[PDB]
Amino acid sequence: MKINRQQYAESYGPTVGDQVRLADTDLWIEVEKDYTTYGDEANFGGGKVLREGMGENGTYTRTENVLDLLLTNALILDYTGIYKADIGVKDGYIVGIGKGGNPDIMDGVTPNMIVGTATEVIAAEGKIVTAGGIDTHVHFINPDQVDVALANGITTLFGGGTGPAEGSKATTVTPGPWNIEKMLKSTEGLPINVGILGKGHGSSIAPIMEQIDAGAAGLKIHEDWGATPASIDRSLTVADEADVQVAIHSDTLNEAGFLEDTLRAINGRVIHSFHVEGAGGGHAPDIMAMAGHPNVLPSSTNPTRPFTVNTIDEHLDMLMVCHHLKQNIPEDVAFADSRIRPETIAAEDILHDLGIISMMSTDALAMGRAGEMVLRTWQTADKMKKQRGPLAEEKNGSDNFRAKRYVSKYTINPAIAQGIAHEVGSIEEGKFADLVLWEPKFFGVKADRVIKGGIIAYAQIGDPSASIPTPQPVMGRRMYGTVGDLIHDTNITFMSKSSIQQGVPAKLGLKRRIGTVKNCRNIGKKDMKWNDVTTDIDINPETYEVKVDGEVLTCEPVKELPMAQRYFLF
Amino acid sequence: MKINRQQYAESYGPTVGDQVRLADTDLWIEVEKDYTTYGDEANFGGGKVLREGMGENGTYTRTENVLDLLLTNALILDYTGIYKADIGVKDGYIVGIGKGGNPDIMDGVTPNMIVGTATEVIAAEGKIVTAGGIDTHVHFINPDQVDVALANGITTLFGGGTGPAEGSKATTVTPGPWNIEKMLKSTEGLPINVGILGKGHGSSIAPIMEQIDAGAAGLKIHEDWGATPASIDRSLTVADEADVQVAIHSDTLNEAGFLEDTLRAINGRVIHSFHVEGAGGGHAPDIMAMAGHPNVLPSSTNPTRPFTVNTIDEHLDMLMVCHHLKQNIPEDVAFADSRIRPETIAAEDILHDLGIISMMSTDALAMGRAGEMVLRTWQTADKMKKQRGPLAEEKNGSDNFRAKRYVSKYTINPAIAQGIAHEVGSIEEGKFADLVLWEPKFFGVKADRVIKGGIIAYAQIGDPSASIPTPQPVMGRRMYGTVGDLIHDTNITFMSKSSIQQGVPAKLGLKRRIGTVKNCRNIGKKDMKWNDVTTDIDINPETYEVKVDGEVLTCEPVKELPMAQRYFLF
Amino acid sequence: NYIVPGEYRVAEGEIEINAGREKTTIRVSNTGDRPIQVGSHIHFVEVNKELLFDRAEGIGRRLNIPSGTAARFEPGEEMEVELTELGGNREVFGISDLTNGSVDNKELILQRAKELGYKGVE
Amino acid sequence: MHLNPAEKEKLQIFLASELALKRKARGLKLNYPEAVAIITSFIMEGARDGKTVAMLMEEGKHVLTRDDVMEGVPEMIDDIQAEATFPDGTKLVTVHNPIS
Amino acid sequence: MHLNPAEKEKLQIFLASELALKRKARGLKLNYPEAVAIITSFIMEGARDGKTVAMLMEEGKHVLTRDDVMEGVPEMIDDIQAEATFPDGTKLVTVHNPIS
Amino acid sequence: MHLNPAEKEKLQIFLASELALKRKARGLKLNYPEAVAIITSFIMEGARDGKTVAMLMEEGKHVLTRDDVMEGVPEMIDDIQAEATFPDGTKLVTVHNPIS
Ligand code: NI
Ligand code: NI
Ligand code: NI
Ligand code: NI
Ligand SMILES: [O-]
Ligand SMILES: [O-]
């Protein structure tokens, strides 16, 4: 007996060779392979396969190769591939990607993916499943920002802040031992993974280093604290010793140096360059040249993503009003004009497409949107396909190459940069079960279910008073993973090795899972999945025009984007 | 080089001699002095002063005279003065009021106010900063009452209740060891400081005393439990032994005595007289005469504050419907008429102005508004300026004398009365960093940011999904100080010495900071800052007219108030 | 009697900044091709290498402008600025690592500035 | 806007009143929560208009009559209470037996 | 509907604007939160209509004049900011000195 | 009013529907959440009016047509579900393929 491919896709989700449109973009992903055995697909429900004696094994105890949770029939979109598999979770980790069920009666069952008495089921047929997003440019300003991030499929927030204090409103910094301790405590109640950055400023080692020992997961160098050669140098010396990452927002004003001076201070050491295009901050006008260097891990923040007709007017005004600049003061106008540049924003779209900027991030509440990292990644990929065509590397008329390049920017690459990719950032065996299910129609717009540590934390779901869960109003809501003590087991506080060795968790009474930051100092651009390109970026000081390999990088702004007015009530 | 005073005030907040209007009242406060060094003002941001090597010291570790937090350029309004200073916080306490920055390069830096790597910054330029309000008449009826209180700048709730039980709906009482233990546990989740009052009723010592040992911070004598000579006597004997305060709502009915009988029972011992005017309760009609005595610490509750055209109609009806009184029953009408009196309410305005009633309080949810203690204090000061003129003591055309007299009523004076002014109630070095920032336009109406123990707990702030924090809707929101375990470090549970000695915190597993109630029994009227007047108050039993020093105290009700319809959506 | 809620009535007069400190005017040229903006409180000798001026005249000094403001030099722009004396202990650490101690060590600051190519060591 | 908790909550009363008024306009006899919402919103808007507590005490008894509401609703509502910002600050209005 | 947090929040602005417009229609001078709500909702509806950020920057200065609002309200509002989904995605609008 | 959790939540649907109806009245093609809100509120008001589940199952397919909504919205909505208090208690209405 045979099933036509339309009916098959409707029942089990798509299989090899089938394509799926990402939301309302022009982007199509194609199933590269499928781990199933046709006819032995797992599924759950009345008269379905995962029943005792059948696709559910009735013999084995939980320890004996049995899963806590099976996601059936997932279409995985990950740097590692775009493919169809069951995903098996146990102890809050992904233990098996393959084919789940019961070896009693089914062929091709992955040996550690037995559905047994202890197994919960999530139907992922017809869904796209990705890793949870890793946002490494978070200002901790307003706790309401967390649900915003969860609703767009973000599961890890790295950054800093003490709430809406001016320091925190400008910079991703939790300064000093006491503020870091306080925010580690606060973190116990935030249903998302967290890592905290200390202040990457000082001219003696001890004031900087004591923040790492106190529990910081990294450092932020910010011009508002003085992005001087000395602050850059000491931060990196601390980071080399402590094995944590340093993010930089460089000296826009060129006050103590130009870009070349910042690069000299860095002296070949590894650094994460934030909003590398420069609208969000950095050496005017040539900061984006950072993204050509092998020791630089470059990220964009999201408001320039992608280049649209409203972008420039929005940014000029934003800059002026947020720095209290006057329109009648020529120095203010000159500064604004030197910082907000169509030439660099347009080139930023293309640098993403070429794999030269490796990472996306929000800049949540300082100059970026907490819930639009994933959204804008795909809008950018879509714009680039429209303007530049399918990339050379594509085949079968799919956008798989571009989709892997782009998904990498907000999943694996930030995880690698931060030193946390042993735990998070991709759907791979042995990593924490931070998983986002998406209806393809809502892909990159509104997550269906966000799984944190193997338990749903956040879901678009309806009337809690109804007979069934789908009646209106369907809205984003915190689920059981966020409630009571379960918030401790489903989320990770990422911390420096030294703070962990020094017993900071026990000292502060932290109950969350503790993740170790490590392997941050001997990576480079070459380690950024699908985004590993180094090149000489030239930025013309007069015209601001960006060149790579002798060619000007320019594109037009678009009047309209997908993943916009079709979806949003405001 | 010189800066004109208009530009200076706009950049750094006002300086010596400058005046600021309080919201939309006629009240002007004047800067009395300024701790700054002109040209070395601290400020934070791009190209600003608090940067490494500059106004931020890059040498010193946190222990070495460095702050956790600097509020730059605050205009402090406090019983201690109205003046311009930087405020330095460390370990959750105010450690320095003076001039913050970097002694490397700045003149006049207060030695323990170094801005270093560990320092967070809050810009207070152009803001008024006060102590958090201390509300000592709180019924714990509805947990939603907490944000209401935070939004109007209240940071400490003293009172009692178990939620909307009739006992609690009438009286500020958490009765007995078990209810007190339960509410101490509940308190672990309330983002505000708390002290709990037991039932000040009984004829044997042991039933009353066991509430103090159990963790009560004080006692409430309420007519609804029998405000008899015996209950008054035993409560005060317990309070003298335990070093805690007793609040009284006396026998309105004059059932077991008149005012003189209550005074005889009190027998010269210290007591807090609640809603001393008497609309809120007490010996009809002469209770307000309490406020003349040296052993009485007198507070008003807020609905009589100040006397307006709607006051009497509102109160008569409120009384009648809340006591199930009928309009056709002459005894009910007589009772209402004996209790709600324009003569005493009008005199209450003036007694506030003269420093004869020392304290304001809400009576939250029993006969008062949780979020209007601060609001109504200023409306009262404004009305009094309009009707009585600048007080004799004023100079320079400022309202500084009146402003200190009035701010004292809801900050320092309740703290002194309760025995907690070593911790809270004023902006002084060595006290807990409970601080409220106000935009002058919103002063006393809607707090900008409420700092609890050195971390923002509550803020008026906008869209959490926005690029920046100011886009609409701007509303009151809990901040990071309230989240997870940080709620423990940012708030104080105030408790009796005996409960603390007996290990009640450890027994109940309380994680909040534990504050000791003490020095409650050898204070008097003379200890009430700016409100220390004792005098013979005569209340005519026939006409209800109030006399002090041979003069009738009367004023007109007003048809309109400031801090009202310009501000409130409902 | 129109009420502007929270309005200031500032007193008369003017605020003199950096009162009683020595002032010094010097010419400074941005020899670079990108703009340079200099804040009020950066040790003046430690600014961007490409600013050409008499580096010795920047030692122990900063711009005599209101706290928190900055002077802007467009590419190629030469202009005069006024400097005032640093106060406090008159020590500088960090920034460009030219001082790391008393500003009185002129010889040592200038030697470092020269070795690192800070323009205008004379 | 600087909405405080009560301002956010009381928006709900206005919305419930708008809903109930639409239901009355298409000819429905109003139920208990509908009737309450209408009269409550009326009080809050009256305070905004600058009426006195005494005026609203009177007017609130004439917003809905027994023929506007379902059987038993008049007897379910003993009084409706609302606090709003009058020109002279927040005051409490109690309307007794609003529907005879 | 799949409402995200901001969509739920911004419903409140529309509702506050509806309330304020009714108050203006019965002849009241509008207060601070009323004025803010009206202009904010105007911006968000303008984005929904497909206007540009530049258009809304202009138009927002002409939604209410000083005779629409109480004394001091023009001077209390320095600028009103809103983010909405334009045809080209979320953008920030700042209207400076909306009421002269 | 004694609002229970669902009564507070479902006020939001009515409000979203009012917003969407205003947008349709000024000539916009409605988006996904707009369309959903309109049809949902229609069902809840229909139950309040005393219509049957069968009636609302029919009527809900004719509230909006494909020319009322943006491209792709008809195909995004497979069915809209709402629970409301009918004269005979709470019932579930599912409207299948509301926009053809
Ligand atoms: Ni930045
Ligand atoms: Ni940032
Ligand atoms: Ni009382
Ligand atoms: Ni009371
Ligand atoms: O940033
Ligand atoms: O009371």
Spell out the domains of chain C, with CATH numbers in brackets. 1-122 (2.10.150.10)
Interface membership of B469 toward A (CB under 8 Å) = yes
| Long-range pairs for B322-327: beta carbons < 8 A, 24 or more residues apart | B322/B367
- Name the 3-class secondary structure at B277: coil
CB of B95 closer than 6 A to ligand 6?
no
Q: Are strands A28-30 and B120-123 parallel, antiparallel or unpaired?
A: unpaired
Provide the residue count of chain B: 570
Q: Which amino acid is at B329?
A: I
Q: Which of B432, E76, B479, B9 minimizes the C-alpha distance to A169? A: B479
Resolution (A): 1.9
| Structural domain spans, chain B | 1-131+426-483, 132-425+484-570
Technique used by the depositors: X-ray
Please say whether the dihedral angle defined by the alpha carbons of residues D27, D32, D36 and D39, taken in this order, is positive or negative: positive
Residues 6+ apart with CB under 8 A from B313: D52, D53, D54, D57
B281 Cβ closer than 6 Å to some ligand 6 atom: yes
Q: Pull the structure tokens for residue F91.
A: 């019932």
Identify which of B25, E5, E16, E4 has the alpha carbon closest to the alpha carbon of residue D1: E16
DSSP codes of every residue in A161-223:
-SSS-HHHHHSS---HHHHHHHHHHHHTT-SSEEEEEEE---SSHHHHHHHHHHT-SEEEEEG
F2-100 has CATH 3.30.565.10 classification: no
Residue in A352, A403, A412 with CA at minimum distance from that of residue A134? A412
How many Cα atoms occupy the beta-carbon half-sphere of C110 within 13 Å? 14
Catalytic residue among B293, B315, B323, B422: B323
What is residue B243's DSSP assignment? T
Chain A hits for C34, CB-CB cut-off 8 Å, are 254, 258, 283-286, 541
Pairing of strands B93-98, B81-90: antiparallel
Q: Nearest 5°: phi and psi at A87?
A: -120, 125
CATH class of B132-425+484-570: alpha beta
Q: Which helix (H) or strand (E) holds B507?
A: helix B504-508
Composition of chain E by helix, strand, coil, percent to 5: 55, 20, 25
* CATH entry, B1-131+426-483, from 3.40.50.300, 3.40.50.720, 3.80.10.10, 2.30.40.10: 2.30.40.10
Query: Any idea what the Cα angle at residue A378 is, between residues A375 and A384, rounded to 5°?
Result: 140
Question: Chain E partners of D14 at a C-beta cutoff of 8 Å?
Answer: 15, 19
**Catalytic residue status for B315:** no
DSSP per-residue letters across A261-307: HHHHHHTT--EEETTTTSTTSSSTTTGGGGGGSTTEEEEE-STTSS-
Copy the structure tokens of residue D28: 């429905």
CB spacing of B1 vs C18 below 8 angstroms? yes
Residue B264 in tokens: 């005889």
Q: What number of other Cβ atoms are within 10 A of residue E100's Cβ?
A: 9
CB B279 within 8 A of CB B344: yes
Q: Which of B462, B467, B566 sits opposite E73 (nearest CB)?
A: B566
Q: Which amino acid is at A485?
A: D
Q: Please state the three-class secondary structure of chain F as a single string.
A: CCCCHHHHHHHHHHHHHHHHHHHHHCCCCECHHHHHHHHHHHHHHHHHCCCCHHHHHHHHHHCCCHHHECCCHHHHCCEEEEEEEECCEEEEEEEECCCC
Given the structure tokens 């789940």, which residue do they identify? A100
Identity of the amino acid at B199: K
Reduced to 3 states (helix: H, G, I; strand: E, B; else coil), residue B113 is coil
CA nearest A568: which of E19, B299, F20, B433?
A: F20
Cβ–ligand 6 distance for B405 under 6 Å, the answer no
B426 is written with which tokens?
């004023």
B366: CA distance to ligand 4 center in Å? 5
CA distance B145 to C47: 54
Give B94's strand partners.
Answer: B89
d(CA A155, CA A161): 18
Q: What DSSP string runs through A50-103?
A: -SBTTTB-SS--TTTTB-SEEEEEEEEEETTEEEEEEEEEETTEEEEEE--B-T
Judged by CB atoms closer than 8 Å, whether chains meet at C50 and A258 is answered as yes
Question: Tokens 């601070």 identify what position?
Answer: E32
Residues from D in contact with F at Cβ < 8 Å: 12-13, 15-16, 18-19, 23, 26, 28, 32-33, 36-37, 40
Pairing of strands A193-199, A492-495: parallel
* Distance, C-alpha A519 to centroid of its chain: 19
Q: Do chains A and E touch (3 or more CB pairs under 8 A)?
A: yes
Whether B170 has a binding-site annotation, put simply, is yes
Report the alpha-carbon distance of residue C62 to residue C40 in Å, rounded.
6
Q: What is residue B512's DSSP assignment?
A: S
Ligand 6 and B85: CB distance under 6 A: no
All residues of chain E having their beta carbon less than 8 Å from the beta carbon of residue D49 are 26, 28
3-state secondary structure A217-234: CEEEEEHHHCCCHHHHHH
Residue of D19, D22, D79, D80 to mutate, testing the F interface (most F Cβ within 10 Å of its Cβ): D19
Is B139 one of the annotated binding-site residues?
Answer: yes
User: Residue B318 has which token pair?
Assistant: 């409120």
Angle at B319 between CA B315 and CA B325, to 5 degrees: 140
Cβ–Cβ under 8 Å, residues A32 and A41: no
Q: Which helix (H) or strand (E) holds A547?
A: strand A546-548
Minimum-distance CB partner of D48 among E16, E28, E36: E28
Q: Let me know: does A159 contact A174? Beta carbons within 8 Å.
A: no
Cβ distance A507 to A499 under 8 Å?
no
**What value, to the nearest 5°, has the Cα angle with vertex B182 and ends B176 and B186?**
140
3 state SS for A446-503: CCCEEEECCEEEEEEECCCCCCCCCCCCCEEEECHHHCCCHHHHCCEEEECHHHHHCC
Distance B353 CA to ligand 6 centre (A): 22
**Touch between D and C (at least 3 CB pairs under 8 Å):** no
CB contact under 8 A, B310 and D48: no
Question: Edge to edge, what strands does the sheet with A551-553 contain?
Answer: A537-539, A546-548, A551-553
- Interface contact A254-C42, CB threshold 8 A: no
Per the CB < 8 A criterion, the answer to whether B201 and B225 are in contact is yes
- The distance of C58 to chain B (nearest Cα, Å) reads 14
- Looking up tokens 């004829």 gives B203
CA distance C83 to B385: 49
Establish whether residue A249 lines the binding site of ligand 5, counting it when its CB lies within 6 angstroms of any ligand atom. Answer: yes
CB contact under 8 A, B52 and C15: no
Of B21, B47, B108, Cβ closest to residue C6: B21
How far apart (Å, rounded) are the C-alpha atoms in residues D40 and D47?
Answer: 11
Beta-carbon count within 10 A of E67 CB: 8
- Both tokens of residue B254? 């004059």
Task: Provide Rg for chain A, Cα atoms.
Answer: 24
User: Is A292 an 8 Å CB contact of chain B?
Assistant: no
CA distance A225 to A223: 5
Contact yes or no for B472 and E40 at CB 8 A? yes
Extract the tokens encoding B440: 């002058």
Whether A472 and F40 lie within 8 Å, measured CB to CB: yes
Which chain D residues have a beta carbon less than 8 Å from that of E23? 45, 48
Cβ of B365 closer than 6 Å to ligand 6, yes or no, is no
Interface of chain E against chain B, CB under 8 Å? 4-6, 9-10, 12-13, 16, 19, 31-34, 36-37, 40, 70, 72-73, 76, 80-83, 90, 92
Broken C–N links (> 2.5 Å) in chain E, after residues: none
Indicate the SS3 state at residue B135.
strand
Using an 8 Å CB-CB cutoff, list chain B residues near A204.
58-60
Q: Of D7, D11, D49, which has the smallest distance from its Cβ to E28's Cβ?
A: D49
Residue F76's closest CA among F66, F91, F86, F63?
F66
Catalytic residue, candidates A272, A283, A315, A323: A323
Q: Determine the distance in angstroms separating the CA of C11 from the nearest CA of chain E, rounded to an integer.
A: 21
CA distance B87 to B98: 6
B280 pocket-lining for ligand 6 (C-beta < 6 Å): yes
D58 CB contacts (<8 Å, ≥6 apart)? none
| B400-410 helix and B342-353 helix, angle to the nearest 10 degrees | 110
Tokens of A409: 């920017």
Q: Are B112 and B88 in contact (CB under 8 A)?
A: yes
> In the beta sheet, which residues pair with residue B159?
B138, B196
Give dist(CA B266, CA B259) in Å, integer.
Answer: 11
Which DSSP helix (H) or strand (E) runs through B317?
helix B311-322
Contact A546, A539 (CB under 8 A): yes
Q: Give the domain ranges of chain F.
A: 2-100
C touches E (3+ CB pairs < 8 Å)?
A: yes
Distance of alpha carbon B357 from alpha carbon B274, whole angstroms: 11
Count of H helices and E strands in chain C? Answer: 1, 10
Interface residues from chain F to A (CB-CB < 8 Å): 4-6, 9-10, 12-13, 16, 19, 31-34, 36-37, 40, 70, 72-73, 76, 80-83, 90, 92
Residue C3: closest C-alpha in chain E: E72
Q: What angle do CA B69, B72, B77 make, to 5 degrees?
A: 105
- Residue A195 · residue B22 · CB < 8 Å: no
3-class secondary structure, C67: coil
Instruction: Find chain B residues with C-beta within 8 A of C84's C-beta.
Output: 39
Would you call D1 and E26 a contact, using CB atoms and an 8 Å cutoff? Answer: no
Q: Are F39 and F76 in contact (CB under 8 A)?
A: no
Rounded (5°) CA angle A36-A41-A47: 175
Residue to mutate among C55, C96, C99, with most A CBs inside 10 A, is C96
- Residue A298 main-chain phi, psi, to 5 deg: -90, 130
Is the CB of B249 within 6 Å of ligand 6? yes
Query: E1 and A475: CB-CB below 8 Å?
Result: yes
Chain-chain contact of A465 with F6 (C-beta, under 8 angstroms): yes
Kindly report the number of other CB atoms within 10 A of residue F22's CB atom: 14
Distances (CA, A) of B215 to A355, B171, B201: 63, 18, 17
Q: Residues with Cβ < 8 Å from A96, sequence gap 6 or more?
A: A67, A86, A87, A88, A110, A112, A113, A429
User: Which chain A residue has its CA at the smallest distance from E53's CA?
Assistant: A310
Is B222 touching ligand 6 by the criterion CB < 6 Å? no
Q: How far, in Å, are B40, B516, C60, C91, C107 from residue C44 at the CA level?
A: 16, 52, 8, 13, 16
Q: How far apart are CA E68 and CA E71, in angstroms?
A: 10
**Cβ–Cβ under 8 Å, residues B435 and B420:** no
Task: Look up residue E73 and give its amino acid.
Answer: V
- Please return the burial class of C88, using the count of CB atoms within 10 Å of its CB with bins 0-12, 13-18 and 19+: middle
Tell me, using a 6 A CB cutoff, whether residue B363 lines ligand 6: yes
